[PDB]
Design a protein around this ligand. Structure first.
Ligand SMILES: [Mg+2]
Ligand SMILES: [Mg+2]
Ligand SMILES: [Mg+2]
Ligand SMILES: [Mg+2]
Ligand SMILES: [Mg+2]
Ligand SMILES: [Mg+2]
Ligand SMILES: [Mg+2]
Ligand SMILES: [Mg+2]
Ligand SMILES: [Mg+2]
Ligand SMILES: [Mg+2]
Ligand SMILES: [Mg+2]
Ligand SMILES: [Mg+2]
Ligand SMILES: [Mg+2]
Ligand SMILES: [Mg+2]
Ligand SMILES: [Mg+2]
Ligand SMILES: [Mg+2]
Ligand SMILES: [Mg+2]
Ligand SMILES: [Mg+2]
Ligand SMILES: [Mg+2]
Ligand SMILES: [Mg+2]
Ligand SMILES: [Mg+2]
Ligand SMILES: [Mg+2]
Ligand SMILES: [Mg+2]
Ligand SMILES: [Mg+2]
Ligand SMILES: [Mg+2]
Ligand SMILES: [Mg+2]
Ligand SMILES: [Mg+2]
Ligand SMILES: [Mg+2]
Ligand SMILES: [Mg+2]
Ligand SMILES: [Mg+2]
Ligand SMILES: [Mg+2]
Ligand SMILES: [Mg+2]
Ligand SMILES: [Mg+2]
Ligand SMILES: [Mg+2]
Ligand SMILES: [Mg+2]
Ligand SMILES: [Mg+2]
Ligand SMILES: [Mg+2]
Ligand SMILES: [Mg+2]
Ligand SMILES: [Mg+2]
Ligand SMILES: [Mg+2]
Ligand SMILES: [Mg+2]
Ligand SMILES: [Mg+2]
Ligand SMILES: [Mg+2]
Ligand SMILES: [Mg+2]
Ligand SMILES: [Mg+2]
Ligand SMILES: [Mg+2]
Ligand SMILES: [Mg+2]
Ligand SMILES: [Mg+2]
Ligand SMILES: [Mg+2]
Ligand SMILES: [Mg+2]
Ligand SMILES: [Mg+2]
Ligand SMILES: [Mg+2]
Ligand SMILES: [Mg+2]
Ligand SMILES: [Mg+2]
Ligand SMILES: [Mg+2]
Ligand SMILES: [Mg+2]
Ligand SMILES: [Mg+2]
Ligand SMILES: [Mg+2]
Ligand SMILES: [Mg+2]
Ligand SMILES: [Mg+2]
Ligand SMILES: [Mg+2]
Ligand SMILES: [Mg+2]
Ligand SMILES: [Mg+2]
Ligand SMILES: [Mg+2]
Ligand SMILES: [Mg+2]
Ligand SMILES: [Mg+2]
Ligand SMILES: [Mg+2]
Ligand SMILES: [Mg+2]
Ligand SMILES: [Mg+2]
Ligand SMILES: [Mg+2]
Ligand SMILES: [Mg+2]
Ligand SMILES: [Mg+2]
Ligand SMILES: [Mg+2]
Ligand SMILES: [Mg+2]
Ligand SMILES: [Mg+2]
Ligand SMILES: [Mg+2]
Ligand SMILES: [Mg+2]
Ligand SMILES: [Mg+2]
Ligand SMILES: [Mg+2]
Ligand SMILES: [Mg+2]
Ligand SMILES: [Mg+2]
Ligand SMILES: [Mg+2]
Ligand SMILES: [Mg+2]
Ligand SMILES: [Mg+2]
Ligand SMILES: [Mg+2]
Ligand SMILES: [Mg+2]
Ligand SMILES: [Mg+2]
Ligand SMILES: [Mg+2]
Ligand SMILES: [Mg+2]
Ligand SMILES: [Mg+2]
Ligand SMILES: [Mg+2]
Ligand SMILES: [Mg+2]
Ligand SMILES: [Mg+2]
Ligand SMILES: [Mg+2]
Ligand SMILES: [Mg+2]
Ligand SMILES: [Mg+2]
Ligand SMILES: [Mg+2]
Ligand SMILES: [Mg+2]
Ligand SMILES: [Mg+2]
Ligand SMILES: [Mg+2]
Ligand SMILES: [Mg+2]
Ligand SMILES: [Mg+2]
Ligand SMILES: [Mg+2]
Ligand SMILES: [Mg+2]
Ligand SMILES: [Mg+2]
Ligand SMILES: [Mg+2]
Ligand SMILES: [Mg+2]
Ligand SMILES: [Mg+2]
Ligand SMILES: [Mg+2]
Ligand SMILES: [Mg+2]
Ligand SMILES: [Mg+2]
Ligand SMILES: [Mg+2]
Ligand SMILES: [Mg+2]
Ligand SMILES: [Mg+2]
Ligand SMILES: [Mg+2]
Ligand SMILES: [Mg+2]
Ligand SMILES: [Mg+2]
Ligand SMILES: [Mg+2]
Ligand SMILES: [Mg+2]
Ligand SMILES: [Mg+2]
Ligand SMILES: [Mg+2]
Ligand SMILES: [Mg+2]
Ligand SMILES: [Mg+2]
Ligand SMILES: [Mg+2]
Ligand SMILES: [Mg+2]
Ligand SMILES: [Mg+2]
Ligand SMILES: [Mg+2]
Ligand SMILES: [Mg+2]
Ligand SMILES: [Mg+2]
Ligand SMILES: [Mg+2]
Ligand SMILES: [Mg+2]
Ligand SMILES: [Mg+2]
Ligand SMILES: [Mg+2]
Ligand SMILES: [Mg+2]
Ligand SMILES: [Mg+2]
Ligand SMILES: [Mg+2]
Ligand SMILES: [Mg+2]
Ligand SMILES: [Mg+2]
Ligand SMILES: [Mg+2]
Ligand SMILES: [Mg+2]
Ligand SMILES: [Mg+2]
Ligand SMILES: [Mg+2]
Ligand SMILES: [Mg+2]
Ligand SMILES: [Mg+2]
Ligand SMILES: [Mg+2]
Ligand SMILES: [Mg+2]
Ligand SMILES: [Mg+2]
Ligand SMILES: [Mg+2]
Ligand SMILES: [Mg+2]
Ligand SMILES: [Mg+2]
Ligand SMILES: [Mg+2]
Ligand SMILES: [Mg+2]
Ligand SMILES: [Mg+2]
Ligand SMILES: [Mg+2]
Ligand SMILES: [Mg+2]
Ligand SMILES: [Mg+2]
Ligand SMILES: [Mg+2]
Ligand SMILES: [Mg+2]
Ligand SMILES: [Mg+2]
Ligand SMILES: [Mg+2]
Ligand SMILES: [Mg+2]
Ligand SMILES: [Mg+2]
Ligand SMILES: [Mg+2]
Ligand SMILES: [Mg+2]
Ligand SMILES: [Mg+2]
Ligand SMILES: [Mg+2]
Ligand SMILES: [Mg+2]
Ligand SMILES: [Mg+2]
Ligand SMILES: [Mg+2]
Ligand SMILES: [Mg+2]
Ligand SMILES: [Mg+2]
Ligand SMILES: [Mg+2]
Length: 275
RNA sequence: GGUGAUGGCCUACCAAGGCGACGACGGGUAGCCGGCCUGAGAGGGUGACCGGCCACACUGGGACUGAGAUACGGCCCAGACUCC
RNA sequence: UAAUACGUAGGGUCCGAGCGUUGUCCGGAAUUACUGGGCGUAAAGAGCUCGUAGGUGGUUUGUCGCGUUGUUCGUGAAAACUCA
RNA sequence: CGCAGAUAUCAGGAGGAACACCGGUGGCGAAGGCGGGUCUCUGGGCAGUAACUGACGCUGAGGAGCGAAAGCGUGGGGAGCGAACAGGAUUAGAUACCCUGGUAGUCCACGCCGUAAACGGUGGGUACUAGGUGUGGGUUUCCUUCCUUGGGAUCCGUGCCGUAGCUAACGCAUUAAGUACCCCGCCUGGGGAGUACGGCCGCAAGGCUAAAACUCAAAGGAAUUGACGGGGGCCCGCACAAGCGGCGGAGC
RNA sequence: GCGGGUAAGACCGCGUGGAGGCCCGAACCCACUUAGGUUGAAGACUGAGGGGAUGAGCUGUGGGUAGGGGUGAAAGGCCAAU
RNA sequence: GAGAACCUUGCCCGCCGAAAGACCAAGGGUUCCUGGGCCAGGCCAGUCCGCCCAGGGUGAGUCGGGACCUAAGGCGAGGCCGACAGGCGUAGUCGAUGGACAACGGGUUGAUAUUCCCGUACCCGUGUAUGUGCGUCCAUGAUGAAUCAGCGGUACUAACCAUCCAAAACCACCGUGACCGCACCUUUCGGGGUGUGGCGUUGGUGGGGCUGCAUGGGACCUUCGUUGGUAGUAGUCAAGCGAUGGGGUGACGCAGGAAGGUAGCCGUACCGGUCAGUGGUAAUACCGGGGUAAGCCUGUAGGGAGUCAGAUAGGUAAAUCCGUCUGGCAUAUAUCCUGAGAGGUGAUGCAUAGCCGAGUGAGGCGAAUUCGGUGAUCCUAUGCUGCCGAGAAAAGCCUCUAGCGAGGACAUACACGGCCCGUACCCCAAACCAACACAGGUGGUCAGGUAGAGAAUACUAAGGCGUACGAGUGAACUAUGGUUAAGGAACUCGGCAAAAUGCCCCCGUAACUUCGGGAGAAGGGGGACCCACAUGGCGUGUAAGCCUUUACGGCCCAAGCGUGAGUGGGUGGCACAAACCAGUGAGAAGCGACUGUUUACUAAAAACACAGGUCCGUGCGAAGUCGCAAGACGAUGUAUACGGACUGACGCCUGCC
RNA sequence: ACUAUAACCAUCCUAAGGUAGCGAAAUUCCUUGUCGGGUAAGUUCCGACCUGCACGAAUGGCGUAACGACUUCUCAACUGUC
RNA sequence: UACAACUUGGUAUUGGUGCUCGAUCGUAUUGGGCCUCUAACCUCGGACCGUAUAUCCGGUUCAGGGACAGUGCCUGGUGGGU
């Protein structure tokens, strides 16, 4: 749920968080951790590519099985549903009857002690992965893939996941959280059930310190920049920039997608706003 | 310890209680009563005189005298008033 | 414009060594409804429930009689009211 | 809104709200109110056996829970409808009635707010008091075909009309305003004003508790007859319609 | 956790717990006021005071970002007193 | 010494003493010591110097940098891309500020020291050969698996009992695509409507048998209940070391609390000395000491975790290892791991205050070497609890196996064997960075006593300094300060500055409010010393005592030590938080929510920034970036995410075009 | 309906012609606007009126507890600032 | 006045069939539009190999796309980003 904090000090009056009362562990499975580090928003050159990002609290990366096909026909137990900061959602560790422990995303309403099976024969209960040949139309799924074994790439959205629509030939149409419908091949794999932490968006940062914690640096407003460094820069006082807003590099709002994409044909329609 | 006489009347130490919605404590009003006016009555109002009590003595306090002091024209101090 | 309602006259009415005005208080005021109110619309049943305290109890079998009336002497000052 | 191919019309797809007929002066719920179905958990009410407890009863200041719609927060949803808002129109004037559209809201989840002509304008519970006409619910019992709103009786809820009574009257009339009992809310002429100040609640809009001054000598209720009605039924007139001829032009 | 309280609550008193860009205040980091200095002790200080002071903190360490570019909690600041 | 404030020695005085002392790193590189001289340098002289001139001085298997491993990142064979140059990045190899392996105390010269000497230890590397003692070249154990003869009432194939449905329309009615018409109505006759008759149906079954196929029953020939000889006759080795491979291990945040110890201190005892120009102390009292390591033993407080057998293909192959599942044994202070600290040895040693002869000062002798109590920011701790913002890698080590194999494993007497380079000095400073012997900056370690909360502050030890111009003069005037009659902001733009309050404990504290605050709001009272309560509460805890899974064990703890607080009585003083140190307060309002950041070197705000929202873009080899390219960021993220822009907590709102 | 008003209608034109809130304010030039509070005296301040030259609702409006080496003003102590 | 970037078409990396539309209702005009397919091309899907270790890369197989896309050259737009 949500616990609103009590306004002891001024910088802590609006800070409301979600209670992680469900976790069971306090130190991640060490056989499945790799080194990571705040990249600082810099490419091979070292020149900053994306602003606002860099610094913050160091984090430890863990490899988690979005490839969930390497094991089929072998069940696993939901060992412990632990928390990784690196990702929005929650990762739950599974014990396989084989003897592997692999990390995966924790779907909504999943609790320790349930059973997990991964294959074309699995049941339809939430938390099971299986190519879309074997999944009824209309169900709600997540952690979807974009081709037969390229690794799930879409709908990791903590709190939202895709909706299957209809199978024709070798493609399936998906209603998906951006409000868009995508034709995609049906040989991919997916899992049934909404993702967990549906209340994550309820967090109120409330304190610049924690924003820094999560890592992003401050944003320097437009009309305050100097005119040399940015189109709206300048103006003794507050002046709109005398022109329609524009990105710091001279391109204003409006369409940006490069159509003609290999997936341009695969897309059905385009997202709607204010409809 | 104190009082003509028991008692937080006063003192010390113990326990945290006592009073409170069958109206505490707070605020405005006003001497109480036998009585006076009214009303068939219950009741309402009210406290002129007389009378039974209370409290007061230029305003605030305190104490002596003795069987008996709120001691009106008894005492002391402080303020006001008037005067030598 | 033609007053039994203004003023003047007469005449009359009530009262009277007092006659009016004013003001306080009771009455009719059952107009704070105990005696002795009402709640549909005239003013009023809260929006409807459970239920603490309080208020109230479906029967007879049994005592103490503290609610009660029962009587006897035993208090109720004087003054005021009622009788002669 | 259409000649960029509208409407219509046919195939397919999407998606949200709501379930006609059953469906009524009917069920239930204490009250708001509640009905397309299926399953899941579950509340309340009634009939016969009357087995058992045995004065446990009633209702309730404060308190606390429930409580239509509108409104507010958070995040989803958002077909239709639709405050506000634009235009078109009538009108002297229309910031409306009407038309085109159309954002809040309307729906979901959790919190809120607690007011309605929240009406049966009637607090709850018990006992008694002539009937007539129906529904639904459950029981029995007999003409007995034992088919059968065939007949009898019973108790619960539910519509209308009616005696006596009561009532200001309209009206109620055993599901009372009757005749009593027990408890609780409430009112004392109309404005002022359910508002100002205050206390409490609410994040708010505001809600709850609840004043005085000054002014008026009436405001209100049911009912009687008029009058009138861009309210209804039945009637009549160069009233209308069909015809001629006319005045409003000129002089007189 | 216990005692009140619910029917479960919720709520409250009591003790424990010690969160906090919480408070006062040294090191450290800053630069608000005044004074002196302004051919100074100093190409920016000294002294009195002055704010934060468990954090968006500070600091050693070594690395990358090169000029019309970097960087820039944005002042036309910094990028070796420029 | 020619000269002497400035140097050497001595006496006193002052100053720092979380440094103005002592160690290092970075840095500098002879500034270290000794000897000689004083032109030049030192803001003066100068015998002195961080001057110059000569000589001397730096001693390591155990400290540090390479032999080791790695982060950020750099380089980069091939490779990809690029007009050239080059830019990328794989395998790899570099890259400390990290991880890994071993040292203590005393003594020593004018300079070095965990390096030299003394005494006592250690851990790594090679080898010895014997004592344990183990095979391959004998052979015993557990099993284990690649081979010939069939079965799952389930149920291939003609049927039976029972259940709902109808393909080749019989019987009956009815509506009538359309045809034949019987009576009436209608425009004068026509069309047409109504009622009915015969079919036909705009809307083709029932009855019965032959045959063939479809749905279950037993059985016929081929499919078993793994052996009957054989072939424990023969090919296999594990020892011992075996990886560019696998697994554990190493291996990790902030904050908080408490307990146990030490460094270290205080008093006691013990030891040695003590007679102080002065009243009184010749020991009751004073001065000084009272230390002692690593390693090797012990393994406590304490922290974490339970023991055997079978099978499982999962960890790129295989595994006795690690994970998993089954049973057996276990909840035993059982077992294992970790582990500061304490006791013993280390140590009959050393050092030691001082005694003696000997002076630029060395040398021999050498007493006591206990206790308690306080107590850390140091250690247990990389631990425990709790939070979200969820807190490196690799190596070494242990262990498991892939490729071998007729000689390794384990200890020890043994004398052997361990590099090179740094090592002097300075190192909050006249030695580094500032052009200087400059009031500046510079990271880590050590942290005494009395007061105090203290790492502030005041005075002091250890130890080092008075940092290089002096002497003399009551003037202005400037600067640093102290005091001031009365008035108290009247100056002045401004109460600028100055003055002022200032601690602890108690009482009581408004408006307002986001119910936290406001609030230390304001305001007030006590505070010194002595005595008593008291030989007080508290902690600590000895002897003794008690108990026992008997030990570094549990109960009491007289004794002893340390000990806040308060109440009463008394007393001195102007004053009792007297020093240093140590909030001015309140009222009304403007702007900004605040913590915060910024114009180094004139502006710290109302600017910036943010936490809140809004709009838009962004379908994942994403949007947008850097890059004439590969490619990298975005992100090892996925619309509850990311980018861009605007406003800026929160509440009411955010109108019209 | 005494007195100054527009609170109603007609004009043009553009798309409309500033709603709530506040308002001589950080915006108000006349201007020291006018009035009242504070002072003996107040061109600053506070509180109102609205004739807003030239406010105004995300280059956000209005209030807002707390915060501030922020702005203005007043008061008691305080003092050689005078 | 240009240019970076973004965007169009033709042309090339370029293949085939079926349909439907034209100027010398039964005789003729070669290209446009669509549906397919693999084979050019892409693939940041998979799985092998170089390899004893290689997420780069190269080759092989398959899988998805597929004559699109990308890329050049000409060209038109937009173009204070320079
Ligand atoms: Mg907040
Ligand atoms: Mg952990
Ligand atoms: Mg990782
Ligand atoms: Mg570069
Ligand atoms: Mg950004
Ligand atoms: Mg950092
Ligand atoms: Mg998360
Ligand atoms: Mg979408
Ligand atoms: Mg911005
Ligand atoms: Mg700026
Ligand atoms: Mg720049
Ligand atoms: Mg520009
Ligand atoms: Mg500007
Ligand atoms: Mg401007
Ligand atoms: Mg734009
Ligand atoms: Mg007695
Ligand atoms: Mg008493
Ligand atoms: Mg006593
Ligand atoms: Mg009196
Ligand atoms: Mg009486
Ligand atoms: Mg009476
Ligand atoms: Mg009476
Ligand atoms: Mg009386
Ligand atoms: Mg008398
Ligand atoms: Mg009297
Ligand atoms: Mg008496
Ligand atoms: Mg008196
Ligand atoms: Mg007297
Ligand atoms: Mg008298
Ligand atoms: Mg007298
Ligand atoms: Mg007259
Ligand atoms: Mg008269
Ligand atoms: Mg008369
Ligand atoms: Mg009267
Ligand atoms: Mg009454
Ligand atoms: Mg009424
Ligand atoms: Mg009512
Ligand atoms: Mg109400
Ligand atoms: Mg009696
Ligand atoms: Mg008697
Ligand atoms: Mg009597
Ligand atoms: Mg008498
Ligand atoms: Mg009488
Ligand atoms: Mg249609
Ligand atoms: Mg019975
Ligand atoms: Mg009751
Ligand atoms: Mg009751
Ligand atoms: Mg009540
Ligand atoms: Mg009550
Ligand atoms: Mg409730
Ligand atoms: Mg409730
Ligand atoms: Mg509604
Ligand atoms: Mg609603
Ligand atoms: Mg609203
Ligand atoms: Mg809401
Ligand atoms: Mg919404
Ligand atoms: Mg919708
Ligand atoms: Mg409408
Ligand atoms: Mg309109
Ligand atoms: Mg509409
Ligand atoms: Mg109401
Ligand atoms: Mg209703
Ligand atoms: Mg009711
Ligand atoms: Mg009743
Ligand atoms: Mg009736
Ligand atoms: Mg009657
Ligand atoms: Mg009734
Ligand atoms: Mg009645
Ligand atoms: Mg009244
Ligand atoms: Mg009212
Ligand atoms: Mg109130
Ligand atoms: Mg109210
Ligand atoms: Mg009426
Ligand atoms: Mg009538
Ligand atoms: Mg006519
Ligand atoms: Mg005429
Ligand atoms: Mg005429
Ligand atoms: Mg605490
Ligand atoms: Mg702070
Ligand atoms: Mg302070
Ligand atoms: Mg000087
Ligand atoms: Mg300089
Ligand atoms: Mg300073
Ligand atoms: Mg000062
Ligand atoms: Mg400070
Ligand atoms: Mg401060
Ligand atoms: Mg901070
Ligand atoms: Mg360079
Ligand atoms: Mg430039
Ligand atoms: Mg600027
Ligand atoms: Mg500028
Ligand atoms: Mg510079
Ligand atoms: Mg000399
Ligand atoms: Mg000092
Ligand atoms: Mg210090
Ligand atoms: Mg010190
Ligand atoms: Mg250095
Ligand atoms: Mg060096
Ligand atoms: Mg020297
Ligand atoms: Mg010399
Ligand atoms: Mg010389
Ligand atoms: Mg010289
Ligand atoms: Mg020399
Ligand atoms: Mg190469
Ligand atoms: Mg490279
Ligand atoms: Mg590389
Ligand atoms: Mg290396
Ligand atoms: Mg290194
Ligand atoms: Mg040395
Ligand atoms: Mg040494
Ligand atoms: Mg920690
Ligand atoms: Mg401790
Ligand atoms: Mg002496
Ligand atoms: Mg000693
Ligand atoms: Mg395994
Ligand atoms: Mg060796
Ligand atoms: Mg060397
Ligand atoms: Mg040295
Ligand atoms: Mg040195
Ligand atoms: Mg030094
Ligand atoms: Mg120099
Ligand atoms: Mg110097
Ligand atoms: Mg210096
Ligand atoms: Mg420093
Ligand atoms: Mg310290
Ligand atoms: Mg000193
Ligand atoms: Mg010293
Ligand atoms: Mg001077
Ligand atoms: Mg002076
Ligand atoms: Mg003085
Ligand atoms: Mg003065
Ligand atoms: Mg000042
Ligand atoms: Mg305050
Ligand atoms: Mg406060
Ligand atoms: Mg205070
Ligand atoms: Mg003991
Ligand atoms: Mg014992
Ligand atoms: Mg025991
Ligand atoms: Mg004194
Ligand atoms: Mg403001
Ligand atoms: Mg500020
Ligand atoms: Mg600040
Ligand atoms: Mg800032
Ligand atoms: Mg700044
Ligand atoms: Mg500066
Ligand atoms: Mg500056
Ligand atoms: Mg400044
Ligand atoms: Mg900001
Ligand atoms: Mg917003
Ligand atoms: Mg925005
Ligand atoms: Mg937006
Ligand atoms: Mg892209
Ligand atoms: Mg702003
Ligand atoms: Mg103003
Ligand atoms: Mg303002
Ligand atoms: Mg202004
Ligand atoms: Mg002005
Ligand atoms: Mg003015
Ligand atoms: Mg002034
Ligand atoms: Mg204006
Ligand atoms: Mg303007
Ligand atoms: Mg707007
Ligand atoms: Mg705006
Ligand atoms: Mg703007
Ligand atoms: Mg604003
Ligand atoms: Mg406010
Ligand atoms: Mg003043
Ligand atoms: Mg003075
Ligand atoms: Mg072309
Ligand atoms: Mg082509
Ligand atoms: Mg241009
Ligand atoms: Mg230009």
């Amino acid at each position: 749920g949500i616990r609103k904090y009590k306004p002891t000090t001024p910088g802590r009056r609006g800070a409301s968080v979600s209670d992680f009362a469900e976790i069971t562990r306090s130190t991640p499975e060490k056989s499945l951790v790799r080194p990571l580090h705040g990249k600082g928003g810099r490419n091979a050159h070292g020149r900053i590519t994306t602003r606002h990002k860099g610094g913050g609290h160091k984090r430890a990366y863990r490899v988690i099985d979005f490839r969930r096909h390497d094991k089929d026909g072998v069940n696993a137990k939901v060992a412990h549903i632990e928390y990784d900061p690196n990702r929005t959602a929650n990762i739950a560790l599974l014990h396989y009857l084989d003897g592997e422990k692999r990390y995966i995303i924790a779907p909504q309403g999943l609790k320790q002690g349930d059973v997990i099976e991964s294959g074309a024969n699995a049941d339809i209960k939430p938390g099971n992965n299986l190519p879309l040949r074997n999944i009824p139309a209309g169900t709600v799924i997540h952690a979807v893939e974009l081709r037969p074994g390229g690794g799930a790439k879409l709908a990791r959205s903590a709190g939202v996941s895709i909706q299957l629509l209809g199978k024709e030939g070798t493609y399936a149409a998906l209603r998906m959280p951006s409000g868009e419908i995508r034709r995609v091949d049906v040989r991919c794999r997916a899992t049934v059930g909404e993702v967990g932490n549906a209340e994550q968006s309820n967090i109120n940062w409330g304190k610049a310190g924690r924003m820094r914690w999560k890592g992003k640096r401050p944003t320097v407003r437009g009309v305050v920049m100097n005119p040399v460094d940015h189109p709206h820069g300048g103006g003794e006082g507050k002046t709109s920039g005398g022109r329609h807003p524009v990105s710091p590099w001279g391109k204003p709002e409006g369409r940006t997608r490069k159509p003609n994409k290999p997936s341009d044909k695969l897309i059905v329609r385009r997202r709607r706003t204010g409809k």
